[PDB]
Amino acid sequence: NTPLQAIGVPVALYDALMARAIDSADGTPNSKWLVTASRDLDDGQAKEVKEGI
Amino acid sequence: PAPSANPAKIFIRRFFSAGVAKNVVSYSNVMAAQRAME
Numbered sequence: 001n002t003p004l005q006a007i008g009v010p011v012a013l014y015d016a017l018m019a020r021a022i023d024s025a026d027g028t029p030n031s032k033w034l035v036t037a038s039r040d041l042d043d044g045q046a047k048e049v050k051e052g053i
Numbered sequence: 054p055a056p057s058a059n060p061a062k063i064f065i066r067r068f069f070s071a072g073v074a075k076n077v078v079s080y081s082n083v084m085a086a087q088r089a090m091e
């Protein structure tokens with residue numbers, strides 16, 4: 001007769017969610033400003049756009 | 054004292070039968086009480 005008899009499910013839920021938490025912490029890019037160029041931009045001056053930004 | 058004659062004889066005539074050793078709780082209730090412990 002133990003409380004451990006009736007806590008199997010939520011602890012399993014807890015570790016599963018924390019596994020989701022630790023996983024998505026490292027793996028999701030932390031960058032902003034998804035900049036994209038146009039389809040005539042002369043790499044040689046498009047790189048000037050990158051260094052400018 | 055000990056009148057021995059209670060009005061609870063309604064049930065042994067037919068609704069119950071003498072000398073059978075009926076169990077006190079339904080098997081469904083026991084399983085319900087069991088799973089209620091987890």
